[PDB]
Design a protein around this ligand. Sequence first.
Ligand SMILES: NC(=O)C1=CN([C@@H]2O[C@H](COP(=O)(O)OP(=O)(O)OC[C@H]3O[C@@H](n4cnc5c(N)ncnc54)[C@H](OP(=O)(O)O)[C@@H]3O)[C@@H](O)[C@H]2O)C=CC1
Ligand SMILES: NC(=O)C1=CN([C@@H]2O[C@H](COP(=O)(O)OP(=O)(O)OC[C@H]3O[C@@H](n4cnc5c(N)ncnc54)[C@H](OP(=O)(O)O)[C@@H]3O)[C@@H](O)[C@H]2O)C=CC1
Ligand SMILES: [Mn+2]
Ligand SMILES: [Mn+2]
Lengths: 403, 403
Amino acid sequence: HMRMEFRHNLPSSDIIFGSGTLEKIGEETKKWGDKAILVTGKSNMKKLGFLADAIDYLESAGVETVHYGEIEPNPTTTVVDEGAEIVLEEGCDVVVALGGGSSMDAAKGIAMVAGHSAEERDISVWDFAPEGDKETKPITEKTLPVIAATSTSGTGSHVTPYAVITNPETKGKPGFGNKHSFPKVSIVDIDILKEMPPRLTAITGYDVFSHVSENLTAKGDHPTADPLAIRAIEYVTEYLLRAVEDGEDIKAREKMAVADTYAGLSNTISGTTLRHAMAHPISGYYPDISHGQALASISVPIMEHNIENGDEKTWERYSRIAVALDASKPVDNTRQAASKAVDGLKNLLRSLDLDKPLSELGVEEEKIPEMTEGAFIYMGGGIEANPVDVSKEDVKEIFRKSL
Amino acid sequence: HMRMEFRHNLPSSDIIFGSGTLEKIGEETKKWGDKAILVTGKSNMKKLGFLADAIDYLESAGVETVHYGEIEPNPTTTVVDEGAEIVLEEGCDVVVALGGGSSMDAAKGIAMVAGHSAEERDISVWDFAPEGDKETKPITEKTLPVIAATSTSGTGSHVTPYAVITNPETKGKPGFGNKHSFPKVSIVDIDILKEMPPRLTAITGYDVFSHVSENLTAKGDHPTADPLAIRAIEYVTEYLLRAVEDGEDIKAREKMAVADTYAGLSNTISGTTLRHAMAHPISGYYPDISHGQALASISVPIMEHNIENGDEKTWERYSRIAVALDASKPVDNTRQAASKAVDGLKNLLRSLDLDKPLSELGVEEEKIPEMTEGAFIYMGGGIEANPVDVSKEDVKEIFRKSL
Ligand SMILES: NC(=O)C1=CN([C@@H]2O[C@H](COP(=O)(O)OP(=O)(O)OC[C@H]3O[C@@H](n4cnc5c(N)ncnc54)[C@H](OP(=O)(O)O)[C@@H]3O)[C@@H](O)[C@H]2O)C=CC1
Ligand SMILES: NC(=O)C1=CN([C@@H]2O[C@H](COP(=O)(O)OP(=O)(O)OC[C@H]3O[C@@H](n4cnc5c(N)ncnc54)[C@H](OP(=O)(O)O)[C@@H]3O)[C@@H](O)[C@H]2O)C=CC1
Ligand SMILES: [Mn+2]
Ligand SMILES: [Mn+2]
């Protein structure tokens, strides 16, 4: 018998779940600071009115608030470092996020830079970012406390330590963070999530599936995440399409919000693999490409590569994924039973209209070697966690099959 | 549609899982203190040799160690308060537990008393213990850090904030604790667990099932614990009997150790209900009665009472339990489908030889009103979490049916 060995690490988590829980953003933030910077996108939270509510709740609680509504999708080092300057100039002592993964990651990055800086600064978020064997700057408890109110059922960033920041100079899009950047309080408000338009619901919904399906097949044992990851796939297949077709289907929104929370906890305990490692340089070199669409456009080839070079333990995991996708009935540990996850995958991608080759997104074949370099330089952890080896030419071939 | 509302709270968790992970008890304890008190039972850890190993690893790591091997099953206030005096007399700054729930709870209690005490003491663990509407003493970060190495696949105490301490004067056996008493590091060593004799494997195995089955049916929504609780029941039904019949079945031991870890995390997020609330005064008034056997001897009547006074949401949960116990195939939300959990329960109790009336344990009918008073005084939280009301006469009747 092969013995089981693993180490489970999950930072303290405090999740407020329900509709209208934005109410609490003020009371909770006060416990951590008296003056907050409110990190958000540029239009939607404002247009929908939740920006005004959050500011009200914060002020009403007694938290003086500086609004930083500059976060564009796929946040950049410049937008994080410039928000940190505002934290240092205004003396903010707590970072509050209201938005999607782009807002919550920019918030964590701002908390890192501002907490480790001198008076005027002297450090950039990129110092914390992996890059080859570059000795990163340690992320310590100096990191400012973070309050995260997610507006999308996609990234699970409200319950992960990670921030994914793009460097426009290098085009790298690495993730980084630890227990000191895990949000102190996480707010999931169904009234905010239900306003996701259909396309946004589909994109972010598939990010949930991408996290848990990679967490399950990551190398090694990780049994504390597996039940959460499995349950998330079951919720995706049962409720994601319901949420896209009817944004006001509250039960479907609640299930995706729980599934997205599962993915955050699961992704903290375990980790993503080749699919995420290759989707990052896509959004890094093509910033107008959504993270979820990049994941979808390369999933089929990647899952086929891991299955063809896999073993019975990995095949058993892909088989459970297929069952959770309603693509099969019995779990088995063969190459054939694992292949049914590819059929269930294609079905999920089709029902969501996410099955597009990279060509239809704007990616060009000339960019392959650069994106491959980007995957290994900035996502080495994901490549290592993948259940099967991949050389630099394996990844180049995968990219071209996805064109 | 009924909206979903819940708050998830889980303290930071650090779990080292494998065989021979007692190796790490020294390195990990050093990160938290230089002089530890080693809290253990009186004979088994010593007889099996793991006491000598732990002391070695601790010394070898540079942690001077004072051994307190006085913990008897169902720890008492006196044994916790006397261990705290040794912590204060010797100047220990970290509490290390090597044993079952009785050792790990006594360790948490020692950490509480010693951390909040003056020079000589002036406070007892009972000050922290619930007792009617008695204003308990707040448990704060003053609590000494705790390192927990479990020796049994039963209580999940290595990943819970709780300590269950008996007061011999009152006979109460309440549980108490919070984030400040959650072990900093948790070590699960298969080489220690596999030495559990058959009866101990059966008793502690059923405590795992008792936690998760009550966590699932606790009142309100708690979806972050449910997948872990379900997966634990599946592991119990598939592997617990294998572990009892062959203590050296390593895969069965690993599954019960994971299932026991599931139960700890689940019991932290959710909570136990009537079964635990009534099993405590049993061990409180009859200290030689094992916690797990007390749970088993009252389960059938309690589960029948909750099912008869339940609703469709509660019935659906008991139905999922029945499916996980191999007692049924389809999940449904009816009284009939829920009743199949009782059949699967009786099957589990029979295969483990735990189906004994309270009479065969030594309980006497004259003790009913006292045990009922004990349930409400010291386990009010569990009664409140139960999915259906229970009056004081409901609990008296339940006790007599279990005789
Ligand atoms: N663990 C982690 O840290 C993870 C991080 N990520 C990263 O996090 C980011 C996630 O991006 P994602 O969160 O998917 O979407 P983004 O947050 O990047 O942007 C979402 C877009 O949809 C709009 N929007 C957001 N919420 C709503 C709503 N409730 N109703 C209407 N419109 C809305 C926003 O408007 P506005 O412009 O006003 O915001 C924005 O234009 C990506 O960069 C991804 O790489 C991905 C997975 C995990
Ligand atoms: N979350 C919590 O805090 C929970 C707490 N509990 C409480 O925790 C306690 C749990 O008691 P439990 O842990 O079930 O058993 P105990 O730890 O109370 O005692 C176990 C008995 O078995 C022996 N033993 C323990 N491990 C081994 C082994 N590996 N090989 C051989 N013999 C062994 C011990 O010997 P020695 O005498 O040498 O130790 C002792 O006699 C109970 O008091 C229960 O009420 C229950 C559920 C949850
Ligand atoms: Mn993602
Ligand atoms: Mn118990």
